[model samples]
Target chain A: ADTLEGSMAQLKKGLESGTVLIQFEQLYRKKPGLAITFAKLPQNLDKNRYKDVLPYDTTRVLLQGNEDYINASYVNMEIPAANLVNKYIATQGPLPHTCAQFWQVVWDQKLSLIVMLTTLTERGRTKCHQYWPDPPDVMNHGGFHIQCQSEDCTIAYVSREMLVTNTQTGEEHTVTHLQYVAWPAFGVPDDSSDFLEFVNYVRSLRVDSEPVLVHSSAGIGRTGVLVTMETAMCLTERNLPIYPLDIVRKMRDQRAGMVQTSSQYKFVCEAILRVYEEGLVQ
Target chain B: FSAYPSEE
Candidate 1:
C-alpha cells in the first residue's frame, strides 16, 4: 500500500467514486465557527475601503507595524504546512486600493517566489490588478518603488524579475513573480502537464528560508489547490504517504474554505496522481 | 475579461 503505484490507484479510485470531492466539500459545509472573528475585527468592518475584501481573521496576515499605522488586506492569507513551518501566503488578486499592502507584505515577509494562478481578467470581470511594474516602468506604492527588470512569457506561464526599493529606508530586493496564464476562473487547468511544469518551475525557485506567495481571484480556490499539491508532493518525496484530504483540511484550518470547490478537490487528486505517474514521488 | 491561449 505504501508503493507509489498502489497509492496512485487508490487516489484515482477515490476520484472516480466522488468520495474525495464529497469529503472535501463536507469540511467547509460544517457550521462556520472561528470565521466570525474576521468579521468582528474593527479594521475589517470598515465598509468604505476594507469592505467585502478582508480575509477571515483566523487566517489573515497581520502586518508587524505599530497599532496606529497597522494595515491588513482582504487578499492576503498565511498558509503554514504542518511539517514546513511557513510555506506560503495565499492571497487574493490585489485590488486597486490594496496594491500597496500587497507589496508591503511581500517586502515585509521577505518572500521571493510568487505564483499567480489567474489572469488579470476572466470571463468579463477583472480578477486581479496588475500590481508589479512592467519593464521600462517604475511604479510607486505606499512609499515603496517597484521597477520591472525583466519579463518572459510562455504558453503556460509568465515570469518576471522586479526590483523593489523602500524610498524611506533606501533598501532594495529583487523578487520573482510567476503567473499561470491558462487557469480558468472557477475551474482547473485544461492540461495538467502545463500546470505540473509550472509547479515544478515554482518549486525550483522556492527557498526553504522564505515563504512563497500564491494567489488567484479570491485567493482561496486556485491558491488552495496549488499549496495542497506542493505539500503533498513534498511529503511524498520524503517517502511519506500522500493524503490530500488531510492536507486540505490543515490548509482550511489556517484559512477557511481552501480547495474552494468540489471540482477543485477532484483536481487535487488528479494532480497528485499525475505526480505519482511522472515519478515525481519516490 | 477573456481567457488566454486563445486557440486552446
Candidate 2:
C-alpha cells in the first residue's frame, strides 16, 4: 500500500540493518553550534536551566512581561509524508521564579495543552518547579489565578484539568495538563507501550495555534524524545520514510539537541516497529 | 540529510 504498509516495512528494514543507528550517529556528529547570541545575554542567561540548552535567538519566544525572555523555543517540525508541521514550544521545566511567567505564557497564547515530561523531583533532586495547582487548591501567580478542576491518574501519566483566570482582564480558560510520569531523565522508558499510549493520548488532545507546550528538565532530553517519536509516528501513518536523523536535524534547527542520546533515538525506531506489529498505523 | 547518536 502507498500509505502505512510501505512506511512500516521501510522502517523495519532500516532497524534490521543498523542503518538507523548510523543515521543517528551521523546526526549527533553534525548537530549545530550555539551561535544564538540572545539566549546568552546577561539577563537571559539565568533564564536557562542549562546554558547549552538555550533556544535559538532566531526562534526564541518573547514574553510580554517586563523581562521579555524565557528559555523556550518554537519548534515547528514538518513531518514527512503527512505534509504536516507540528507546532511545539520546547521548554525547560519552570523554575520557582518563572512559574508566574509560565502561567502568563499559557494565558497569553490561550494554550490548551501542556505535555510535561519531568516530575517535580527526580532522584531527590528538583527537576522542575510545580507550575500548576493540585486538586482542591488554588495558585495565584503574577496576578493570574490557577485552579485545578479535576485530575485523572492513569498508569503512566497524571492528567490535570486546570482553570486559569486572569484577574487583570477578568478572562478565563481551561488547560489540559498531561505529565508523563514514566519517562526518566536521560533514559528511555522500559515499557515502550506505556510511552506510546501517552503519545496517542496527546494526539487526541492536540492543538496547533496555541502550540503544545512540551517541557523536560533542561528542556531538551526527554522533551526531544517525545517530539521525535510523535513526528516519526506521523511518517509511519503516512507511508513516509521514518528517519530519526532527518527528524532530529529539523528539530535542532528550531531548538538545540532535540534528541539527546543514542538509546533514546533507538527507542523511537523500535517503538515504530511495535506500532506496525500492533497495527497501530491502520 | 543527517543523523543523531547511536544507541548501544
Candidate 3:
C-alpha cells in the first residue's frame, strides 16, 4: 500500500510515460519566436499610472514593467493567507476571498512572500479570521498575520506565521522588524538593501530555472514593472544573454504588452542598463 | 493564486 508521497517512483514513471491526468503540453505552451523585450513599457503604464519613485539598481536585479498580469498558473498555501488577512486590511478587502485561495496564487508563481502596500484598518483586522482553522502558530486574527521582530529570525509576519524555510535542513527562519522595510521597491529606492535580500533569497533556492510570479489587483502597471526588472537582471546575471528591448518585445508578444507609461519604460531601460554597468555588485 | 472559487 503506497501513499502518494511514497509512490514517487511510479509517479515519475507516469510523468515520463505521458499518462498523467493532465499532460504538460496540455497545461503549458511554448510560444516560440514570441519576442520578450526589457525596454518597452506595458500599455497601461504609459500615462505614469503609479505614484512612487523608481528605485535604483544598487544591487542589480533584473527589472521588467507591464500594465497588467494574466492569470495562468496557480498554487496552494492556506496558513499564510489567513495571516495576511489578519495583518493587512488592504489585502482582506470586502469578503468572499478566502485565505486558502490567496495562498494558491502566492505559491503557484513561487513568489517569495506577499507584500501588502496599503494600510490595515481595525475593522479589517477584526474580521481577519472569518474562515479556516486556527493556524498552529502565530498571532493571526481572521487569518491576518504579523511579521515578528527578532534578530536571526526569518519571521517576516507573525500574524501569518510567515517563515523562510531552509531547503537543506527544513528549518524555518524569521526576519527582524527592521528587515521588513528592506524590501526593494516596485519603483526606485534610496538604497539597494531590499534588492540584495530579494536576490539572495532567490539564489538560495538553487533551482535551475523558475519564475518569481508577481501581480497586483488588475495584473498590470506596477506588477509588470517589477516582474520585468527582476527577470531581466536575474537572466543577465546567469549569463542567459538577453537584451532589454528584446525582453520587452517578447513580454508583450506573450501577454497584452509591457509597462503602461513611456516614463515607466524609460525607467526600466535605465535600471537594466545600470545593472549591466554595475556587473554583479552583490 | 485561486482568485475565483470553483470545486473543479
Which order, best to worst by TM-score?
A: 2, 1, 3
TM-score for chain A in each prediction: 0.85, 0.90, 0.40
Candidate 3, residues A95-120, lDDT tens digits: the string is 23333333333333344444331122
**Model 3 chain A: which ten-residue window has the lowest total lDDT?**
A84-93
What C-alpha lDDT does candidate 1 achieve relative to the native structure?
0.69
lDDT of 2 at A156: 86
- How high a TM-score does candidate 2 get? 0.88
Q: What overall lDDT goes with each candidate model?
A: 0.69, 0.78, 0.34
* Per-model TM values vs. the true structure: 0.83, 0.88, 0.39
| Model 2 alpha-carbon drift over 4 Å, by segment | A1-10, A28-34, A65-67, A280-282, B1-8
For model 1 the TM-score comes to: 0.83
lDDT of 3 at A148: 39
Q: Is candidate 1 or candidate 2 better by TM-score?
A: 2
